[PDB]
Amino acid sequence: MFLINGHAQDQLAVSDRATQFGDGSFTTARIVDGNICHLEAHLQRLQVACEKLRIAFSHWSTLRQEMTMLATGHDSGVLKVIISRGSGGRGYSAMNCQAATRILSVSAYPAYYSQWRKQGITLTLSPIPLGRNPYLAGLKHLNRLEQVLIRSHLEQTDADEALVLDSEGWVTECCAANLFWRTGDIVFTPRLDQAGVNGIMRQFCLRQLAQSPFQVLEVQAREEAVRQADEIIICNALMPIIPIRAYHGTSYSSRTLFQFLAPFCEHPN
- If the CB atoms of residues 125 and 186 are measured against a second copy, the closer one turns out to be 125
Q: Judge whether 28 counts as a catalytic residue.
A: yes
Report the relative pairing of strands 121-125 and 178-183 from DSSP bridges: unpaired
When asked if residue 151 is in the footprint of a second copy (CB under 8 A), the reply is yes
Separation between Cα atoms, residue 63 and residue 52, nearest integer Å:
19
Binding part of the chain for a second copy, among 103-111, 227-235, 240-248, 254-262 by CB under 8 A, reads: 103-111
120 binds Cl ion (CB under 5 A): no
**Interface positions, 15-54, toward Cl ion (CB under 5 A):** 28
Contact assessment for residue 92 and residue 21, using Cβ atoms and an 8 Å cutoff: yes
Nearest to 244 by CA among 174, 197, 191, 188: 174
Mark the segment that binds a second copy (CB under 8 A) among 2-10, 113-121, 239-247, 250-258.
2-10
Residues in the chain: 269
218 is catalytic: no
20 binds a second copy (CB under 8 A): yes
- Could you tell me where the DSSP H helices lie in 53-183? 60-71, 112-119, 145-154
The entry of Cl ion, a second copy, none near residue 110 (CB within 5 to 8 angstroms by kind) is a second copy
Q: Rounded to an integer, what is the distance from CA 69 to the centroid of its chain?
A: 23
Binding to a second copy by residue 191, rule CB under 8 A?
Answer: no
Compute the least distance from the CB of residue 217 to a second copy, in Å: 24
Pick out residues in 151-190 that bind Cl ion (CB under 5 A): 176
C-beta separation of 148 from 124 below 8 A: no
150/131 Cα distance (integer angstroms): 13
Q: Is 266 a catalytic residue?
A: no
Q: Does 143 bind a second copy (CB under 8 A)?
A: yes
Burial class (CB in 10 A: 0-12, 13-18, 19+), 48: middle
Which residue of this chain has its Cβ atom nearest to Cl ion in the complex? 138
Please report whether residue 82 would count as binding a second copy according to CB under 8 A: yes
Stretch that binds a second copy, among 82-90, 197-205, 246-254, 261-269 (CB under 8 A): 82-90
Kind and range of the H or E element at 76? strand 76-84
Count CA atoms closer than 13 A to 40's CA, side-chain side: 2
Query: Measured from the CB atom, is 36 or 55 closer to a second copy?
Result: 55
Residues near Cl ion, by CB under 5 A: 28, 138, 176, 198, 236
Return the active site residues: 28, 140, 173
